[PDB]
Amino acid sequence: SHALSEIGFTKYEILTYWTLLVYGPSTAKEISTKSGIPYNRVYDTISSLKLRGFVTEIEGTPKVYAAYSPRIAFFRFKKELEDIMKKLEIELNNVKKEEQRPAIWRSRSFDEAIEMFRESLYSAKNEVIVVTPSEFFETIREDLIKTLERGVTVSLYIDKIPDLSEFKGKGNFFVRQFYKLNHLIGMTDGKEVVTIQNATFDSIGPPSFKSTYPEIIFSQYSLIIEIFKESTLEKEIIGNPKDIRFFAMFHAVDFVKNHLKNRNIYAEITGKNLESGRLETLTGRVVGYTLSLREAVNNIHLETENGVVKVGGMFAVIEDYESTEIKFIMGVDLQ
Amino acid sequence: SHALSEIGFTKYEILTYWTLLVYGPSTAKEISTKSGIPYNRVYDTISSLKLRGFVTEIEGTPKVYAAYSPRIAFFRFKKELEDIMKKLEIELNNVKKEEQRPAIWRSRSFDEAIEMFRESLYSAKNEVIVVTPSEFFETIREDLIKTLERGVTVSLYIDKIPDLSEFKGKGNFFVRQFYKLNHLIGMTDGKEVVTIQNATFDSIGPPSFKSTYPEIIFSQYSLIIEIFKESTLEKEIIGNPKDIRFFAMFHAVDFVKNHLKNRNIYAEITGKNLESGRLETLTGRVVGYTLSLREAVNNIHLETENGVVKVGGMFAVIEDYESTEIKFIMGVDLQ
Numbered sequence: 001s002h003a004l005s006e007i008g009f010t011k012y013e014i015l016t017y018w019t020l021l022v023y024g025p026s027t028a029k030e031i032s033t034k035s036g037i038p039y040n041r042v043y044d045t046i047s048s049l050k051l052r053g054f055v056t057e058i059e060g061t062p063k064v065y066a067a068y069s070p071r072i073a074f075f076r077f078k079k080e081l082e083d084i085m086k087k088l089e090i091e092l093n094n095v096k097k098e099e100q101r102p103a104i105w106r107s108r109s110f111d112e113a114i115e116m117f118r119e120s121l122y123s124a125k126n127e128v129i130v131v132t133p134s135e136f137f138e139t140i141r142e143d144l145i146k147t148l149e150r151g152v153t154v155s156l157y158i159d160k161i162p163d164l165s166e167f168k169g170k171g172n173f174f175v176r177q178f179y180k181l182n183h184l185i186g187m188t189d190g191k192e193v194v195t196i197q198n199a200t201f202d203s204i205g206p207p208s209f210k211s212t213y214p215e216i217i218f219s220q221y222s223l224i225i226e227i228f229k230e231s232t233l234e235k236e237i238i239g240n241p242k243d244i245r246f247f248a249m250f251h252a253v254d255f256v257k258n259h260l261k262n263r264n265i266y267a268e269i270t271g272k273n274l275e276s277g278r279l280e281t282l283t284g285r286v287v288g289y290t291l292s293l294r295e296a297v298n299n300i301h302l303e304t305e306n307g308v309v310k311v312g313g314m315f316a317v318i319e320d321y322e323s324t325e326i327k328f329i330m331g332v333d334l335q
Numbered sequence: 336s337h338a339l340s341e342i343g344f345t346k347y348e349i350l351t352y353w354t355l356l357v358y359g360p361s362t363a364k365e366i367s368t369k370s371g372i373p374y375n376r377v378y379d380t381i382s383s384l385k386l387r388g389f390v391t392e393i394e395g396t397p398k399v400y401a402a403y404s405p406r407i408a409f410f411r412f413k414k415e416l417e418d419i420m421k422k423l424e425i426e427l428n429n430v431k432k433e434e435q436r437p438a439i440w441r442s443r444s445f446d447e448a449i450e451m452f453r454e455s456l457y458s459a460k461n462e463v464i465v466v467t468p469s470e471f472f473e474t475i476r477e478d479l480i481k482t483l484e485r486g487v488t489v490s491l492y493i494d495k496i497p498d499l500s501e502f503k504g505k506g507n508f509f510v511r512q513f514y515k516l517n518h519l520i521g522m523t524d525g526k527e528v529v530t531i532q533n534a535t536f537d538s539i540g541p542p543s544f545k546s547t548y549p550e551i552i553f554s555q556y557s558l559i560i561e562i563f564k565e566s567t568l569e570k571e572i573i574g575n576p577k578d579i580r581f582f583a584m585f586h587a588v589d590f591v592k593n594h595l596k597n598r599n600i601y602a603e604i605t606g607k608n609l610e611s612g613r614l615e616t617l618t619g620r621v622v623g624y625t626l627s628l629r630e631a632v633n634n635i636h637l638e639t640e641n642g643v644v645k646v647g648g649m650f651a652v653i654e655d656y657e658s659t660e661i662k663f664i665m666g667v668d669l670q
């Protein structure tokens with residue numbers, strides 16, 4: 001006897017009690033219509049399993065039936081989910097509304113977290129800041145690259161600077177070093193944050209999560225600026241001098257700082273007009289910045305069509321514009 | 336409106352129509368008890384999804400609910416299958432009967448085939464012969480090694496000999512070269528065969544399959560002997576001189592041929608006694624072989640406790656013993 005088990009139950013989460021009790025036998029021995037003996041005579045269950053891909057029937061006289069192994073049997077079932085999921089993702093893109101309550105999704109484990117991290121990076125349109133412990137880098141190496149290729153800027157914060165050869169042309173890549181980081185923070189387009197805690201789930205420690213709550217974004221944006229203040233800029237790769245993107249204005253300004261002197265810079269910015277609240281797209285020359293760390297101010301001075309303006313980043317209040325959507329196009333080498 | 340879709344149906348393969356229509360909304364927008372509006376008032380469906388891991392609820396006044404993405408949502412569902420599958424595999428091992436009708440399982444694609452190949456290798460207890468086109472090698476490189484480590488002998492047939500450094504101590508590895516091979520044949524312990532056709536599923540070409548039918552084993556064993564006759568022996572790695580295993584006596588004998596001269600060899604064989612039909616385990620010294628290719632004979636002459644005997648491989652009829660279970664232990668270097 002197969003002897004069933006609790007397994008019986010779970011599978012009755014989705015599975016017939018006949019569809020369950022026909023497969024049981026075929027795995028435990030492999031007959032034809034002996035199945036039909038223990039215990040119901042109807043073979044409808046077999047016509048079932050055949051479509052699921054859990055059984056094929058082989059030339060017969062009498063006809064005989066055989067079960068694929070758990071491994072192959074579910075490999076097929078998993079492959080089915082992929083399709084529900086992707087097709088489900090695809091429709092979402094064509095009909096998902098935009099104004100959504102903020103929330104927070106906790107993750108059950110390191111893998112699942114990395115899954116949430118990747119999902120986030122995939123959506124990146126402008127910049128992603130990734131604070132990480134050297135330990136994790138090898139796990140995100142491909143995703144970093146893939147992202148960089150969509151022309152998205154990537155601001156990395158790492159402790160032990162790895163071998164960055166793979167990256168020589170891949171995109172707009174900035175690398176900064178910092179004493180030591182414990183967990184992985186990941187922020188994409190100033191829109192959402194995803195976090196992963198060091199190594200294995202370390203017993204009862206902080207949870208790994210994604211979140212869109214302003215408080216946590218503000219929290220974390222502020223955290224990053226602190227690590228920025230002490231961090232040192234080790235690698236800079238402009239693989240796209242005519243489309244350099246930032247969501248983090250302090251990163252914007254860091255960059256402008258390094259170049260504005262030896263060449264002109266042009267900008268296109270979308271942002272809230274602090275005076276009016278209205279969204280606007282602005283273009284001009286960058287003719288100055290202020291990056292005052294104690295004063296807590298970082299912004300750009302943009303020469304638009306009609307006068308200078310100041311554009312500051314997320315949560316700005318004192319400049320003319322608040323922006324998290326920034327594009328520099330770089331003037332020419334000489335000057 | 337989410338607008339449902341065919342997707343609705345499939346998911347009703349397993350999923351409630353409420354459990355399906357609650358998730359729909361949370362993905363399309365993210366509220367609390369607005370769900371309850373369109374269209375049923377009962378929130379039992381939410382208590383459902385919560386256990387599936389498809390939704391968490393967040394601190395409320397009122398209380399509010401949010402859905403994980405398809406990606407994470409199913410990542411969790413897949414992770415569940417793993418457990419049904421493994422737990423299901425585990426029990427099988429403890430209760431699966433042995434005498435089973437022969438059958439044949441066709442595979443739907445290259446991946447699934449490779450899945451069947453691996454599954455087979457995993458079970459290897461003695462030897463696996465793997466005829467393969469150079470193209471596939473990188474896909475089986477790890478599995479080859481893993482297998483080699485369980486102390487299992489691995490007889491490879493390849494066309495373009497790859498870099499075999501990874502393998503210097505890994506096990507008992509024999510490598511033979513052959514002009515060109517089109518598809519992957521894989522035979523494990525003379526018990527079952529698994530086959531994969533070149534590259535992508537090439538439209539309407541031969542199917543990829545596993546099978547235990549004697550005819551196909553005999554077929555394929557015979558096929559391999561042909562490729563053996565023309566093939567050349569390029570690499571030989573005895574990483575286990577005291578336990579060298581074969582299921583293919585012609586491979587046995589090839590080996591004995593190369594060594595018997597410069598050192599003694601000992602054997603332990605399990606096989607059918609052709610005179611009596613009875614199974615027996617025999618041990619002795621190997622004092623000779625015959626490997627006559629035209630005559631279609633290959634066997635070993637074993638000096639047992641009480642006289643010489645001849646042991647031939649699968650399907651043997653003229654020797655004293657038919658064996659597919661063979662272990663040589665190698666005498667010492669000098670002589």
Ligand SMILES: OC[C@H]1O[C@@](CO)(O[C@H]2O[C@H](CO)[C@@H](O)[C@H](O)[C@H]2O)[C@@H](O)[C@@H]1O
Nearest residue numbers: 296297298299312313314315316317318
């Ligand atoms: O940098 C200080 C801190 O204050 C906030 C919130 O009011 O606003 C500043 O942020 C801008 C860039 O993001 C500054 O340039 C601007 O002067 C000011 O609004 C946060 O943004 C920031 O964390």
Ligand SMILES: OC[C@H]1O[C@@](CO)(O[C@H]2O[C@H](CO)[C@@H](O)[C@H](O)[C@H]2O)[C@@H](O)[C@@H]1O
Nearest residue numbers: 631632633634647648649650651652653
């Ligand atoms: O090698 C010939 C061919 O004939 C078979 C089937 O009768 O039997 C031979 O196989 C043995 C090794 O497997 C030989 O040594 C033996 O003499 C003979 O039984 C098949 O085995 C084989 O394909």
